[PDB]
Amino acid sequence: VGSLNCIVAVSQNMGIGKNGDLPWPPLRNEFRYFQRMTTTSSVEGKQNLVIMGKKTWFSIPEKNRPLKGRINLVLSRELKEPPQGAHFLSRSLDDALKLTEQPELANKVDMVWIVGGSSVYKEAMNHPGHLKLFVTRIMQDFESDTFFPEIDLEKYKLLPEYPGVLSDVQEEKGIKYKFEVYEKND
């Protein structure tokens, strides 16, 4: 299995969701960035795996569920089996990552992408080892009811460049935003 990554888009007040949807109006090219990053596999004959919590899974419109071209794994301790359209169910993040090393998945999975929500991000971000964060900074405040955890910049270094990620300011629907990549290894 390849690298472990989190990806998120976040407002200036750290918001990631409101009422089960995003705090901002749809940013088409921002979503295209998310799909491109999470789907593109560096290794032939492999797909990337996306890990998400239950409320995040159900926040994706049925139309767009499962995320195509990726293995979709949902985290829950209530569900007895994967939701309609999902591929895997795990009871904990550690369980999911352990699963990636089973015969079933060990040679099928390239990158692992944690795609939310807040508690899954927090656990990933505090777990020792090599991890990147792909963060889109939406450069305005938006009313939110779910938030991204604190990024400890003692340990997460902002990279000065990364292939395939534009470095300049983007703007859609009058909303400026920019792309960042952080990396820790502890």
Ligand X SMILES: NC(=O)C1=CN([C@@H]2O[C@H](COP(=O)(O)OP(=O)(O)OC[C@H]3O[C@@H](n4cnc5c(N)ncnc54)[C@H](OP(=O)(O)O)[C@@H]3O)[C@@H](O)[C@H]2O)C=CC1
Q: Does the protein bind ligand X through residue 149 (CB under 6 A)?
A: no
Residue 93 binding: pick among ligand X, ligand D2D, none (C-beta 5-8 Å cut-off by kind): ligand X
Q: Does the protein bind ligand X through residue 93 (CB under 6 A)?
A: yes
Name which position in 4, 5, 6, 16 contacts ligand X (CB under 6 A): 16
Which has the closest alpha carbon to 38: 164, 182, 122?
164
85 is in an annotated binding site: no
For 3, phi and psi rounded to 5 degrees? -70, 160
Residue 119 binding: pick among ligand X, ligand D2D, none (C-beta 5-8 Å cut-off by kind): ligand X
Please give the C-alpha separations between residue 38 and each of 31, 51, 55, 59, in angstroms, as whole numbers: 11, 11, 19, 17
Q: Which of 30, 75, 131, 133 is labelled catalytic? A: 30
The amino acid at residue 64 is N
- Rounded to 5°, the CA angle 114-19-181 comes to 30
d(Cα 7, Cα 47) in Å, to the nearest integer? 17
d(Cα 72, Cα 170) in Å, to the nearest integer? 29
Q: Does the protein bind ligand X through residue 127 (CB under 6 A)?
A: no
Residues forming the active site: 22, 30
Contact residues toward ligand D2D (CB under 6 A) are 7-9, 21-22, 30-31, 33-34, 56, 59-60, 115-116, 136
Contact residues toward ligand X (CB under 6 A) are 8-9, 16-17, 20-22, 52-56, 59, 75-79, 91-93, 115-120, 123, 146
